[PDB]
């Protein structure tokens, strides 16, 4: 409930952050290794803040191939 580990698709990429599955925000600072490309599948660990505008925030993001 409070944290989830999952694979998902990078759905947008911006200067210092991206989004996974249109719902999980990630700062580029939590990416480990190769920067994901748009639409690429990544492994995500994220925390869930329902009392927040953007509920899911990644604590780690990693490409899978």
Bridge partners of residue 17, in order along the sequence: 27
Resolution (A): 2.0
Give the domain CATH number at 17: 2.40.50.140
Q: What 8-state DSSP symbol labels residue 29?
A: G
Which is it for strands 17-20 and 3-13: parallel, antiparallel or unpaired?
Answer: antiparallel
C-alpha torsion sign, points 6, 3, 28, 16 = positive
Q: What burial class does residue 2 get, using C-beta atoms within 10 Å of its C-beta: 0-12 exposed, 13-18 middle, 19+ buried?
A: exposed
What was the experiment behind these coordinates?
X-ray
Domain interval for residue 45: 3-63
Return the percent helix, strand and coil in the chain, to nearest 5.
5, 55, 40
Give the number of domains in the chain. 1
Q: E strands within 14-63?
A: 17-20, 24-27, 41-48, 56-63
């Amino acid at each position: 409930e409070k944290q989830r580990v999952f694979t998902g698709i990078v759905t947008s990429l911006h200067d210092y952050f991206g989004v996974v599955d249109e719902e999980v925000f990630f700062q580029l600072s939590v990416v480990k290794g190769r920067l994901p490309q748009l639409g690429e599948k990544v492994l995500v660990k994220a925390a869930y803040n329902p009392g927040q505008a953007v509920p899911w925030n990644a604590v780690k993001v990693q490409t899978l191939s």
